[PDB]
Amino acid sequence: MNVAISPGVTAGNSLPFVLFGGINVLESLDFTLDVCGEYVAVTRKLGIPFVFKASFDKANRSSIHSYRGVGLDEGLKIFAEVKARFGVPVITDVHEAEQAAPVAEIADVLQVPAFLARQTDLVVAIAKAGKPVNVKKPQFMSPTQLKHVVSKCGEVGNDRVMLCERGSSFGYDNLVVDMLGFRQMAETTGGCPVIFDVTHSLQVLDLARAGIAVGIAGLFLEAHPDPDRARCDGPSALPLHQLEGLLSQMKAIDDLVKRMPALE
Amino acid sequence: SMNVAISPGVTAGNSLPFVLFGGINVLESLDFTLDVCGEYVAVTRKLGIPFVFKASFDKANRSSIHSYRGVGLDEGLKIFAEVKARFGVPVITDVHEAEQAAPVAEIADVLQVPAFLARQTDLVVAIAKAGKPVNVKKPQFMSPTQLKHVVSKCGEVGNDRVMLCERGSSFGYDNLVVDMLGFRQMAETTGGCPVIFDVTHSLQVLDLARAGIAVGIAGLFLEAHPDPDRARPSALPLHQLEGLLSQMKAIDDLVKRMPALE
Amino acid sequence: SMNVAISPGVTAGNSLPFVLFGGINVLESLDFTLDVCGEYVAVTRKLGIPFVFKASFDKANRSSIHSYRGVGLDEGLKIFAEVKARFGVPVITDVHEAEQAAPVAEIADVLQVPAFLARQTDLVVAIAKAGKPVNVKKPQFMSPTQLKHVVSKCGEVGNDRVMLCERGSSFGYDNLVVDMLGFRQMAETTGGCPVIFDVTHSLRQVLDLARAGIAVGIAGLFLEAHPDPDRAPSALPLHQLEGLLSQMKAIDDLVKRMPALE
Amino acid sequence: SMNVAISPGVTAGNSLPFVLFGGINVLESLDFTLDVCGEYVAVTRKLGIPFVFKASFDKANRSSIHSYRGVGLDEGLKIFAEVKARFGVPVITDVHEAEQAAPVAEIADVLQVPAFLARQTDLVVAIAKAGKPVNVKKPQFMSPTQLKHVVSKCGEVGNDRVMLCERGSSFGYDNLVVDMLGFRQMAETTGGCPVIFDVTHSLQVLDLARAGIAVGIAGLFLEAHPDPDRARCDGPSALPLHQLEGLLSQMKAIDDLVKRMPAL
């Protein structure tokens, strides 16, 4: 199944990989524009399809007082300016059923947060909003169970679903990426595009190389100019200056493996 | 060990006689709820075990939009109101949306945060703000030392009456295992919150229940059904309730009068 | 289920009063061995708990070839002979090489298969052939239902006196978690072999784990102790032994007179 | 980092073209061994991939004491001598008991420490003292940063020619997952030992092999058989032999590409 996101950007497991790349959360217009512009410049140079990613709300910080981002209303204003400035499609996450329709007016893909992937009403609200849907696979969920979420989407008329790996629970706290999961998610859901979040899955290069070599529809990436200074106990973003170096290796492997067959 | 007063005559605490949070998966009819709740009340009253009746009014996380979800909020609250009026038993239920907490708190005696939702700031705050004691289910993805953050969110909005509920940790794909070292970790990192063990969702129910009760905990969380084979995770057969509870009580009374080592 | 006669008045069985397999990590000196065992003997005699003294004569799997390995076979067996002569207690020790089994079985009353060697056909067969009861340590990588194949190898060469020993299961990197449901799976898939729980290797929280395992209803506890474990995984502080054991006996005596559910 | 010379024209190293350590589960007869080795030689030659033939002379841990164990030490070494004589290939086998190390080392070119026995001091020392390169199998219970203890044991008795072989990690009961982050950790914590990936035991063979090879490693470890379904084992299934060329051509293409890409 190939999922058409915007003109010239289509995701599919046999197609050239799509970078879903951006930042953790919207803090300001200018900072968003500058980071997005650098993503655009690099992906344009290399010839990699690109969807810009950001959250408008951090809905699950440790403290009710922790910074949560600019929020829904201002976030969608920022996304509108990004789309106008760069002609790039955008993807963002949706935490509450009531956000789905307003977000769908602006965003080109709506993401189901991993912890919320089983919540029927949220998933239905997101699926009914009429845009392609990216389902984050929670660390507690095996790859053959994601089909139920895909089915809930199809039951309310949305067949344009993508599935995003971000690791599996491995003891306490640690995540392991089972590289056999990508095919199992694809094959049990009718061939949904599979995307790999190499940021939350934690050596980013080892992991991204491993995942791209398997043969997948997309990469999911967060970046920052200075990741070590994040005001976050979240997982480290890629340092932004490393983007081109990373993506040139990804494209090289991706172009190679996408012309190699399965074993007969 | 902080103790949490649920009602007169029911108080949960890690040094106190265990409390049974028992009932059924989801509310379906007044008739069946009363049937099951009445058996729990009679057995617990006979054995002398503090009791809080448990049920969901909605199953918010089923695999299909057409899969039966239960009677829903408005009818659920009416059933709980009857359960309370007829038996004088306190009740606990789970809350899935922020806007549900206030109306639920008018009837329910304890509000539960669903496991998958434990990290969501707005839902937890709405539950905590509703002013009843809160039961936080520990997600299978969460280590026992991280639950303190959810509790702190509750404290941050004025609710210090928080209990923690164990239901297993992810062990490979699909399977859950219960780390019995987790109960003390949960308790000691949260200032001594009552710890509760869900022996149904964790899954040999007797083996697990015996093990958890022997550690010394505040409560057991249990679902039962008259015929769990032919119902559409597996509840205790309702006819085994008395036999299970008599062992739980026997072990619990023994261990709650034994100390830590020197 | 099946009972394993270890020595006169010491019999291990899942329905019988629990047996303590207790001692120390490794034999270092006669003096120290006698000091610790003497303490175990006096506490178990006082409390009325069947006792088997445990120690390795060699640490075959330590991180450097210069790391201290214990007194070794010849001297270790001499120490075990003294222990037996002086206290009249039976002893258990582990066997790392096939040719050690015959010599060890002249002195030791139970031979143990080390966890990492449990699948090695030739070692297990030599141990089973030596003619004493066998304790099989369940490796952290093995599921509870697979231990049957090791027990059958013992049976294939005429040794039907086999016990099984839980020490935890791999949980992510490095850490171990004890699945309390494993005891019954081990017992039921092996014709009811006695199941023993190593609370030491499985890991301040020795008490939580020990209470939980003893409450399931098992044949034995495996325990290592040391007078000053911090300044010496981590053994129980020896001065805590009587406190730990009095609680284990109390729980075991209670649960061993309770049935399965109807 | 470290390069281990196995024989003329065969050298394993994490920066070098990958080496195939390839063969069969156990030595059953001379002629079957020669035929299978002959097929590996033909394909590795055609493709230009360095090759070491692998086989066990004993299956030391079957479920039943009556189950077939292969030809045994004495006859196995006679078969190995003939393989070397006939094909000019180096060979690798596993050693289960201390006393087998010296006689095995007279014929074998690499001696392998079985995974379950990797912590056994006396076995590892007898293997290390035998004077040939050593392949330590990483047991599914051992974390990648702990393998350094085994390498140090080998060094303490004068053998610095050690390679480390990934076979998966325990993931719940029975299942294994391959953590693709472990390869670097094994290499960096041991002074740069060649890291090798057993795509057989670790279990979709192509997904896993593509992922591992893309990370950048010294070797692949593979068992094959003309009819794996009819194996008289309940062990993990061998690669069908007829798929060897197709698998290895993809491995070569990916390895050649990534071995000339830098760090970020």
Residue numbers in the entry:
A (entry chain C): 1 to 202, 218 to 279
B (entry chain D): 0 to 202, 218 to 246, 250 to 279
C (entry chain B): 0 to 202, 217 to 245, 250 to 279
D (entry chain A): 0 to 202, 218 to 278
Paper's wording?
Using only seven Burkholderia species to select orthologs of essential genes, we solved structures for 49/406 essential gene families, and for 56 total Burkholderia protein targets (including seven ortholog replicates). Of these 56 targets, 25 satisfied criteria for being a potential antimicrobial drug target.
For the seven pairs of ortholog structures (with no bound ligand) solved in this study, the average overall Cα RMSD was 1.5±0.5 Å, indicating a high degree of structural similarity. This structural similarity suggests that the ortholog approach is an efficient method to obtain useable structures from otherwise intractable targets, thereby lowering the barrier to structure-based drug design targeting infectious organisms.
